[PDB]
């Protein structure tokens, strides 16, 4: 639980179909996350360089936000107002959940998820392999929590696709 994963979840659980970059920043839980990456950026400045901490908070914040946009988890719905579309993230999570639950009802152990298939089922050509793993990683984590009696452990290998590994308890 750190960095853009924490922001990923903040977003994931928002209820809004979208949110403006502006508003998103004013959220308390989001500030805790940037102030954290903020301290790293301060330690990382080159000799002689000295930006204000706020300059670093805002900078950390844009970096945290782009981390998700570059993997396709959130979409920049409107550049003009800096509004993000939170749906790609909510659908990608939902799609994850469904796959995990079916593979389990089938006792699959090891199964593949192709990136192109996910881009096609949902309708987002910008999702990336990293974006897919981070979502399935979180879902597999929650699944083990809600069903200890079913899922013992899990792993995600890579191909352009992820290889999901599942091992059961009873």
Structural commentary:
This protein is α+β, with helices and mostly antiparallel strands. It is 55% helix and 18% strand. α3 packs across α4 and α5 (87-105) crosses α7 (129-146). One of its GO terms (cellular component) is chromosome, telomeric region.
What percent strand?
A: 15-25%
Distance between the termini: 29 Å
Count the DSSP helices: 7
Largest sheet: 3 strands, antiparallel
Nearest-angstrom radius of gyration?
A: 18 Å
CATH superfamily membership of the largest domain: Stn1, N-terminal wHTH domain
**CATH topology descriptor of the largest domain:** Arc Repressor Mutant, subunit A
Please render the helix and strand layout as text.
Elements: H1 4-12, E1 18-20, H2 21-26, H3 28-44, H4 53-69, E2 75-78, E3 83-85, H5 87-105, E4 110-114, H6 115-121, H7 129-146, E5 151-158, E6 161-168
Antiparallel strand pairs: 1-3, 2-3, 4-6, 5-6
Brief synopsis:
Helix content is 55%, strand content 18%.
Task: Fill in the keyword field for this structure.
monomer; 170 residues; alpha+beta; Arc Repressor Mutant, subunit A; Ribosomal Protein S8, Chain: A, domain 1; 2 domains; 3-stranded antiparallel beta sheet; 7 helices; 6 strands; 55% helix; globular
């Amino acid at each position: 639980t750190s960095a853009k994963s924490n922001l990923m979840l903040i977003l994931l659980g928002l209820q809004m179909k979208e949110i403006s970059n502006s508003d998103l920043y004013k959220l308390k839980e989001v500030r805790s996350v940037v102030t954290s990456l903020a301290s790293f950026l301060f330690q990382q400045q080159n000799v002689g360089v000295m930006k204000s901490f706020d300059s670093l908070e805002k900078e950390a914040f844009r970096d945290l936000v782009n981390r998700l946009v570059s993997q396709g988890l959130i979409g920049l719905k409107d550049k003009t107002s800096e509004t993000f579309d939170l749906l790609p993230l909510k659908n990608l999570f939902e799609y994850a959940e469904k796959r995990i639950s079916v593979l389990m009802k089938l006792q699959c152990y090891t199964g593949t998820v192709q990136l192109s298939h996910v881009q096609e089922k949902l309708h987002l050509p910008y999702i990336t392999t990293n974006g897919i793993v981070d979502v399935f990683k979180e879902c597999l984590k929650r699944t083990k929590k809600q069903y200890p009696e079913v899922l013992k452990n899990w792993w995600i290998d890579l191909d352009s696709g992820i290889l999901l590994h599942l091992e059961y308890a009873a």
